[PDB]
Design an enzyme around this catalytic site. Sequence first.
Site, PDB file in Angstrom:
ATOM      1  N   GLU A   1      56.352  46.205  32.032  1.00 37.22           N
ATOM      2  CA  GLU A   1      57.804  46.363  32.295  1.00 37.22           C
ATOM      3  C   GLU A   1      58.640  45.416  31.448  1.00 37.22           C
ATOM      4  O   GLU A   1      58.309  44.220  31.314  1.00 37.22           O
ATOM      5  CB  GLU A   1      58.172  46.152  33.778  1.00 37.22           C
TER       6      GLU A   1
ATOM      7  N   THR B   1      53.056  39.594  46.941  1.00 36.69           N
ATOM      8  CA  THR B   1      53.891  40.732  46.633  1.00 36.69           C
ATOM      9  C   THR B   1      53.254  42.066  47.002  1.00 36.69           C
ATOM     10  O   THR B   1      53.982  43.061  47.088  1.00 36.69           O
ATOM     11  CB  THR B   1      54.259  40.748  45.138  1.00 36.69           C
TER      12      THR B   1
ATOM     13  N   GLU C   1      34.679  19.150  24.314  1.00 33.15           N
ATOM     14  CA  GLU C   1      33.727  18.220  24.932  1.00 33.15           C
ATOM     15  C   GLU C   1      33.785  18.279  26.451  1.00 33.15           C
ATOM     16  O   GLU C   1      32.747  18.223  27.134  1.00 33.15           O
ATOM     17  CB  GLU C   1      34.017  16.786  24.455  1.00 33.15           C
TER      18      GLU C   1
ATOM     19  N   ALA D   1      52.238  48.663  36.477  1.00 33.72           N
ATOM     20  CA  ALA D   1      51.061  49.233  37.094  1.00 33.72           C
ATOM     21  C   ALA D   1      51.226  49.381  38.614  1.00 33.72           C
ATOM     22  O   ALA D   1      50.225  49.523  39.317  1.00 33.72           O
ATOM     23  CB  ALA D   1      49.836  48.379  36.734  1.00 33.72           C
TER      24      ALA D   1
ATOM     25  N   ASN E   1      48.852  29.661  44.266  1.00 34.19           N
ATOM     26  CA  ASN E   1      50.273  29.497  44.596  1.00 34.19           C
ATOM     27  C   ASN E   1      50.443  28.723  45.875  1.00 34.19           C
ATOM     28  O   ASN E   1      51.350  27.900  45.984  1.00 34.19           O
ATOM     29  CB  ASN E   1      51.071  30.810  44.712  1.00 34.19           C
ATOM     30  CG  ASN E   1      51.301  31.521  43.389  1.00 34.19           C
ATOM     31  OD1 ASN E   1      51.214  30.922  42.314  1.00 34.19           O
ATOM     32  ND2 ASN E   1      51.670  32.797  43.471  1.00 34.19           N
TER      33      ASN E   1
ATOM     34  N   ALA F   1      53.942  36.907  35.960  1.00 30.55           N
ATOM     35  CA  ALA F   1      53.474  35.526  36.095  1.00 30.55           C
ATOM     36  C   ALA F   1      53.018  34.955  34.763  1.00 30.55           C
ATOM     37  O   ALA F   1      53.419  33.840  34.382  1.00 30.55           O
ATOM     38  CB  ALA F   1      52.327  35.456  37.102  1.00 30.55           C
TER      39      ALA F   1
ATOM     40  N   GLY G   1      48.996  44.361  38.960  1.00 32.09           N
ATOM     41  CA  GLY G   1      48.281  45.370  38.195  1.00 32.09           C
ATOM     42  C   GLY G   1      48.213  45.039  36.716  1.00 32.09           C
ATOM     43  O   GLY G   1      47.198  45.281  36.064  1.00 32.09           O
TER      44      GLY G   1
END
Lengths: 66, 439, 426
Positions: B71, B179, B253, B99, B206, B12, B144
Amino acid sequence: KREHEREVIQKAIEENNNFIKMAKEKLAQKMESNKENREAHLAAMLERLQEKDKHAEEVRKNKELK
Amino acid sequence: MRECISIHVGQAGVQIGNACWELYCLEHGIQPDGQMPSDKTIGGGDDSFNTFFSETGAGKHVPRAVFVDLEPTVIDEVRTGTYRQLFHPEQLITGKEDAANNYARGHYTIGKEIIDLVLDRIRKLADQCTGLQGFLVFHSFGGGTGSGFTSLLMERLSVDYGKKSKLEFSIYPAPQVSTAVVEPYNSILTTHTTLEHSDCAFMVDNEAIYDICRRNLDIERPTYTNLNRLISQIVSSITASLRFDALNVDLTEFQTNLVPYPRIHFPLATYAPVISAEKAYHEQLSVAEITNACFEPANQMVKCDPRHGKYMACCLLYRGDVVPKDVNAAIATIKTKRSIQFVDWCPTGFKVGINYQPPTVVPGGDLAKVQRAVCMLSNTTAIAEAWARLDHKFDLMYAKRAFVHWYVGEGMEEGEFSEAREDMAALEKDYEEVGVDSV
Amino acid sequence: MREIVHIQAGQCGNQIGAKFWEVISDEHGIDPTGSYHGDSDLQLERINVYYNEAGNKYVPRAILVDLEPGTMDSVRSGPFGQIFRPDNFVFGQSGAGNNWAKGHYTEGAELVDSVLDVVRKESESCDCLQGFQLTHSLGGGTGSGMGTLLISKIREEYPDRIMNTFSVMPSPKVSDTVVEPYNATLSVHQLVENTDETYCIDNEALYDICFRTLKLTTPTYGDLNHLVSATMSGVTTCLRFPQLNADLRKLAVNMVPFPRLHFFMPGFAPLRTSQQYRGLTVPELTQQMFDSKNMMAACDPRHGRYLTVAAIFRGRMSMKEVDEQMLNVQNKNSSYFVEWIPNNVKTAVCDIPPRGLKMSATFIGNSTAIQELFKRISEQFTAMFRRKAFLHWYTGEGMDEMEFTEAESNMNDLVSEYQQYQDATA
Ligand SMILES: Nc1nc2c(ncn2[C@@H]2O[C@H](COP(=O)(O)OP(=O)(O)OP(=O)(O)O)[C@@H](O)[C@H]2O)c(=O)[nH]1
Ligand SMILES: Nc1nc2c(ncn2[C@@H]2O[C@H](COP(=O)(O)OP(=O)(O)O)[C@@H](O)[C@H]2O)c(=O)[nH]1
Ligand SMILES: [Mg+2]
């Protein structure tokens, strides 16, 4: 007035440093604890498997005895 | 000056960072080879776009960021993607194993391998910067890498860069695109860990983005590509004060106003107008329309009800053909109609900025180019609802200690789980305290 | 580079594994000569999960193992017997005589070391080995006893690798060895403590399906195998073709709420000369996937509760429609899904459908109902072991009745836990 000004800024310095220190130590503790833990698990699974290997040797000796 | 280094952890993180960077090239006139014809200064400069894009002798404008994923697969498409020339090989960092949706695996078992190399690449980028401002981290709670390696990198950045800024773009897990069953675990744990190292955290649900696309873009089953493109529009509006520069107001700010207290650093974001290219044809959206849209609850990135809570800050970052006068009118109008309740300790004002640079849409996008867009950021206590939902899932599985063994085998300990949860419960009570009216 | 060493042991294991390899080889465009001729890059994109490249010959990363050479000889004789690396073939001569003790302690023990050698060579070639998958039957001798023995010796060498076993549940209808219940229980015991994830391929069901659904008065072993191969192709489609549960570790992470409950009921749809050309509407396809008649395991899902479930839709189909169908089954069938495990159902869709199907559905679930199957095995064992029937067989190799007891208790414990979580609420 000038001293207090020097005090403030040194306090802010010491604040940042202290944070970096605490952060560093904590991360080092959690890495080692996890590492020990994980190795332990692996070492116990291996020892269980080894104890199963010995049982199979004994079963083989029991058959040879007869 | 005021360079920002962008860090994209996880799938992501990586993909959303490819969306963003493309849009930023399109907005700044940067080509896919990095050559920006508009930029007469070669090898350097002080242009706003230089805070996010570095330059070379050849005139190529390299992005200031680092894509790390455990990966190769995800960063590999970047390596071979259209914008592969823009990025530099060192900036892309990929291990060999993921992971497997395990925070534990990504924080300790795997992360530790690549963490030092990552920090290494960041450091190189940091030396290029004359006055680095902070870091922009993009990740997802559920994965992970997005949880375990992301927190690890947060701690490391705290130590190695001290109290430099560290903002975040956290992908709130959505069952539609879920997932992993264990994603609530990773979410709690990463939220617990980075809570002390993040200066300002923007969450994107999402589910909320999935809805917006189906509704406003009429997409039947929005893909991660749809989401990402919409996400990049939001990001671009937030970073537009940095990359572009009379009415434009620095996001600092806004930050000084969206964080009343250190733990309350999650602002809600609502963008407008998201419209399809057919619908946008023969329709002109006023400042007043987009402004309403901001206060529309279905337009928010996180699903929560602001009315249920109180506002502690409410900022409006506009972009395009906007004039102060129209913004003043629309705001007043809103007021007359809406119930924008503010905590008593906070001034009931709307900080505004107008960046005349008009918005851009990626070609083949489902978003219609508009002449004006706005993205309001608000510090309302409604955000807590989010935590709650999550937390509640976390508690459900954790009572039966489900999947807990996967964490424990990596070396984690149930203490970490309980501690993380306690902290979330404290955060939720902190939101309630800040809403209480002053004695 | 997420290689999965494959290992087929025992008569049943060698046969089902040969089928699996042929079928995935077709799906990936690889003929028995290892040459590739597929139309789609997708076949070669992940072919390395199960294949090693070579004149560009994708060789199955398989190790064949049987204490009787005949079975492996037939495998070599069969199609693709060339594709398998000859050195991967490893067979003894004594055979197990349908004895779990013979494979796990005596003859298996003699051959185990040569098997591990091939395993070590295959694992060494693997760049990022995910783990091992074992095709075997729990009723026989080489597959079970020697199988479980191999599981334990491999685990010691690779304690950090996923361990998947397609164990085949013995069936009284299939009959075969009389002491087969003992062997199955011995295998189950080892599996309960040595396999990360286990697919309960009950022959009984396979049979039942055939006789009934397939309207086969005399289901043959080839019939059963065809069911198994289609199941196996389904449950490997995410492993072999380019998200949900894409490697063995993530599947488990998301489907094994607890380590003992790593036993799952496979399911496939559609399952019959009547063509009936109508391309099963996704709706149906979903219903069939959850249908107990389409469950390869011999348990009624409605008789238990789904801890976790995973769906695979091969074939070009409306992802939106699939999504709604799944959600619907969960909603209407909500009592059959544990509440303490949010989002316990997850689904994936693959564009490439099985051979000769425009679309398919693959069902994988850790239903607490799985305890029915263990219960049938336990009854068989208790009946024989009550009279010590054929126990001298195992005692001759040096086994002790306590070992059988421990194995019975372990299997009752697994059932108890399945029922425990089934009957637990918020
Ligand atoms: N909005 C959005 N969400 C995404 C995207 N890609 C993945 N996700 C979300 O991320 C979650 C999974 O996180 P990942 O990025 O894939 O996790 P990871 O970082 O690769 O970590 P690993 O498990 O080890 O592979 C899912 O719950 C998705 O909802 C994306 O491209 N856009
Ligand atoms: N479905 C199916 N089951 C099989 C097949 N071959 C053997 N079996 C089962 O295997 C069990 C006996 O195991 P066996 O093949 O002899 O193991 P071995 O001693 O190691 O060779 C029997 O209960 C059969 O049900 C097959 O081709 N298909
Ligand atoms: Mg990944």
